[model samples]
Target chain A: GWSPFKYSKGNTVTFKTPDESSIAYMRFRNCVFTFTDPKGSLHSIDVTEVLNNMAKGFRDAQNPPSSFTLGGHCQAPLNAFSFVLPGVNDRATVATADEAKKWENCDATLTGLQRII
Target chain B: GWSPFKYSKGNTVTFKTPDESSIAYMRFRNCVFTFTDPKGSLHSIDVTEVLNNMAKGFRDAQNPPSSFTLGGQAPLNAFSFVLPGVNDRATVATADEAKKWENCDATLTGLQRII
Candidate 1:
């Protein structure tokens, strides 16, 4: 379920894969996030890749290096989702059209599968 | 003034120092941002420092390597502010009590002049 919560640097939010077939997408806005995978490896997801792919008109599913343990700092609000099908769980509850349009047009290549359902 | 806008990586939003005395702070919740200074040097602001400082109750005005030409990727929203009497155009903003606590602590350290 989606619930609005206040964001602070000291707190971390974790998202687990619904199953082996689960996929997730997070919109960072103007923030910086550090992701820790299931293996405990740390990865930093920055703005360049997100902006690039969005500008290129791609709707690919972005796979995390792994999953779980997401933490970050932001001067603003962040949006996120997890799914097994195109619009399941949190994905089913949010507007996808507007989100897709926001990232439209970029020069970067995107990987994973684009949601077709 | 604040306006609601969509975020995309290819497009960059820049905030300049209102003047030499201005300082800025940006909150990056779940996104990634690339900051470029006046000299055109680039820096990346990530989660660790933000979280660490927030947890420690420290609010020092973070000086960018330089200033201006800020860009990055984000999925939702971002907030920022430029404070007067600080060293750089972009530091951190005081939105929550934690940030305020940091700003107060920063004042004690003499790193930034209180606004």
Candidate 2:
């Protein structure tokens, strides 16, 4: 699902594999994302490499969510995204592109991000 | 003129007054801009306040460019902008929306920036 992710310092996000989205391309500014490869190696790198691959947009999202964090915080906070803010539950799940759009700020506590580092 | 501003640490930009723009709103992520008030005081804040004003979009661009900088760099560097990476000229001048679009990397020494 594609929804507006408001720009802020950074928020932790965790997404599910096989998530559907609206915009084919995703871009973020000055963001850093830390993740572990399916091979189980830890890596922290720029979010543009992950989200705005252009040729491989969300290719990572199609795989199972591995360990994830933003600036050393929560682990995998979004199940679906235009990047959402995590809750006490670190809630993540399934939603249609249309279902996610109806949320505000979001009622589910989602936020937006382009780049993460 | 509207193009694209790539995400970087930061590049100083200076744009002309009364510049015609394609997109009405501009946004930069994790970006902070520093500018002086027309009243003659120095203020270093966020670019969003100046560029992404929305209701008052580019209002400051409508006036004479006052003292400007990014992280204490040069004076106004761009005459037109989709936020360029500056050069020695600190070049700022007249550019039609179409003319700017024709540039490369930019060979005319131009680039694209958007919010």
Candidate 3:
């Protein structure tokens, strides 16, 4: 259950896994802003990558600039999960859409299990 | 005009001021997350401030973790507006909304013209 009480920087929570057969799932989000010219207006952009080296770079880095650290878990399910602050500049790299699709293919060469439910 | 091109980390932008008699307007945004207890879930929260020392602290600090630096603009409407990185923990401080709104009033004592 979600509560209305304000949660600050140091607050932590616990959640249940719900079932027996489940594997780890991962999530990534990035929001970046940049000034387009030498003028004063603001332009913000949102970027997303599902499978790339950039994602790996983020996962391995010691410090990331913009992110909330998350981790933990439930029972009958092999319990306990933890995520550290990902690296800031590390990002996924894919040369082409074919490569991207190959990365997503279940039995494809680049395919590695990331989420199980 | 807005374009579809992708912008990178070091890219800079310039905008024209709409008119002659406008003062600068400042924008503040904070989105935060926290884990409620020791169990291992996630909860997110958002906070806002208009006039407080915390805001001043942020404006004064040399580096901030989650913000993009912005500056520079038109003329007469004159030129150049720049913002450096704000502090991570600095925030506005006030005991009450009367104080908050007081901070908002035209000639209020606590109102220091942050924008």
Candidate 4:
């Protein structure tokens, strides 16, 4: 059964193929951002262009920025990244981690963006 | 490949593009009326503009009226019908079909007022 909706739920995960010929080149996109107000209220904003734009800096480098953090010291900013390949599309705009238990216990209580890779 | 993220799914049967388009249009614009009582029973109700500020009669042959049905009755009080470009396309209220469906369903469920 083939499904159009292919999704994975993880804080830090990788999408890979054993066969190199499976994809052409890769593209990275940023989709949206979620913000929390000072009053502990939550808000999600759509970043239309940030998700559509491609990053040139990561394309040439083999070591890509995979994991990221947001909303430190009360300021929330949008983040994006991708896995590069030949003609492959990276349609992930928001960091899709619920809560990473590394440094600070920052709970991810916002809706990140979704994209097609 | 143009990956524009179009979507369609079915948990029920007998669907279409235009026949559906009309039924959908009717259902979209149809005002619902229901009544539910204490014993964990539910009822629904709907109404159309009986007499508005305009005080207009049925404009088109297929003009919809404020009507509704509940607890198994033959769709009472000004049944909704579709006219060729009259009553404003339900899809017209939406920029996209998905958006139209969302608004229509939401309004029907009494979550928000239908304009």
B24-95 per-residue lDDT for model 4 (tens digits): 222221233322222323322222221111112223437444432221232221112221111124323444
lDDT of 1 at A57: 29
Score each candidate by Cα lDDT.
0.29, 0.32, 0.23, 0.25
lDDT of 1 by residue, A1-117 (tens): 332223333334343334434223322233233333223444433333332233232234364322334323432122222111111112333357775444232112112222211
Lowest summed-lDDT stretch of 10 residues in model 1 chain A?
A81-90
The lDDT ranking, best first, is 2, 1, 4, 3
Most accurate candidate by TM-score: 2
Per-residue lDDT, model 3, residue A6, is 19
List per-model TM-scores for chain B.
0.21, 0.23, 0.21, 0.19
lDDT of 1 by residue, B28-86 (tens): 23223333333333444333233223322323445432223432342211222111112
- C-alpha DockQ for predicted model 3: 0.02
Kindly list the per-residue Cα lDDT of model 4 for residues A7-82, writing each as its tens digit: 2222432323223322112222232233332234332322222222323224455555442233335343322222
Candidate 3 lDDT over B22-56, as tens digits, reads 22332333312221211222222221232122333
Worst lDDT run of 10 residues, candidate 3 chain B, spans B78-87
Q: Model 3 misses residue A97 by how many Å?
A: 52
User: TM-scores of the first chain across all predictions?
Assistant: 0.20, 0.24, 0.21, 0.29
The TM-score of predicted model 4 comes to: 0.21
Question: What tens-digit string does per-residue lDDT give for candidate 2 at A35-105?
Answer: 32223433222333234433134345555232333322435333223332121111232245554344322
Q: Which stretches of model 1 miss by more than 4 angstroms?
A: A1-117, B1-5, B19-21, B25-66, B71-115
Ranking by TM-score: 2, 4, 3, 1
For model 3 the local lDDT of residue A50 reads 21
